[PDB]
Amino acid sequence: MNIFEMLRIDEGLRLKIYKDTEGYYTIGIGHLLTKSPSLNAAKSELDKAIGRNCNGVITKDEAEKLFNQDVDAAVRGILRNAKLKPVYDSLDAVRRCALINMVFQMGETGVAGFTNSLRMLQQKRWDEAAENLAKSRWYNQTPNRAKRVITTFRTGTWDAYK
Ligand SMILES: [Cl-]
Ligand SMILES: [Cl-]
């Protein structure tokens, strides 16, 4: 298992514009286009992102290109983040993937707010951090996925995904 496979499982693949769980225009593998209610805004955003006249649809290759870009952006964001970098450096490989997953989903900024969970991951207090993470909107809105990421943190294995 690896991050890509991991996220592929959590986000799915869709070649046509679609709305996320929060109602936002998205495409490919979890690629948020816009928070705006307009499909046009979304459509515009999309074309700008592919570099072509898409019409709300993309190819698989296009979806993967975007995905590669996003994961890379995420790793770089964490490494660049004063609050995230240390947590990250402090972790093992599997758990690192779990932090990347959250960041991909909620942004550096949203993850950075899990001040408490973070301190706990840093101290290697697995069960405690798991419970703390569970006390969140995140958990309450996307429980299954949340649970998958959380187990990953608690155990350090890919069991949740197998
Ligand atoms: Cl809560
Ligand atoms: Cl879910």
Q: 77-98 in b/e burial notation, b at 16+ Cβ within 10 A?
A: bbeebeebeebbeebeebbbbb
State yes or no: 144 annotated in a binding site.
no
Q: Are 108 and 78 in contact (CB under 8 A)?
A: yes
State yes or no: 140 annotated in a binding site.
no
Q: Report how this structure was experimentally obtained.
A: X-ray
Q: Are 28 and 63 in contact (CB under 8 A)?
A: yes
The phi, psi pair for 16, rounded to 5°, reads -130, 145
Dist CA 137 CA 141 (whole Å): 6
CATH number, domain at 125? 1.10.530.40
Q: Which domain holds residue 76?
A: 1-162
State yes or no: 104 annotated in a binding site.
yes
Joined tokens for residue 106: 């909620």
Q: Which ligand is nearest to the CA of 136?
A: 1
62 catalytic residue (yes or no): no
CA 152 – ligand 2 centroid, Å: 15
The phi-psi region of residue 156 (left if phi > 0; otherwise alpha if psi is between -120 and 50; otherwise beta) is left
How many separate domains does the chain show? 1
For residue 88, give the nearest of 111, 54, 61 by alpha carbon.
111
The catalytic position among 20, 64, 128, 131 is: 20
The catalytic position among 5, 10, 11, 70 is: 11
CA 53 – ligand 2 centroid, Å: 32
CA 100 – ligand 2 centroid, Å: 17
Q: 118-136 in b/e burial notation, b at 16+ Cβ within 10 A?
A: bebbeeeeeebbbebbeee
Q: Are 67 and 129 in contact (CB under 8 A)?
A: no
The phi, psi pair for 27, rounded to 5°, reads -160, 170
20 catalytic residue (yes or no): yes
CA 10 – ligand 2 centroid, Å: 8
CA 101 – ligand 2 centroid, Å: 13
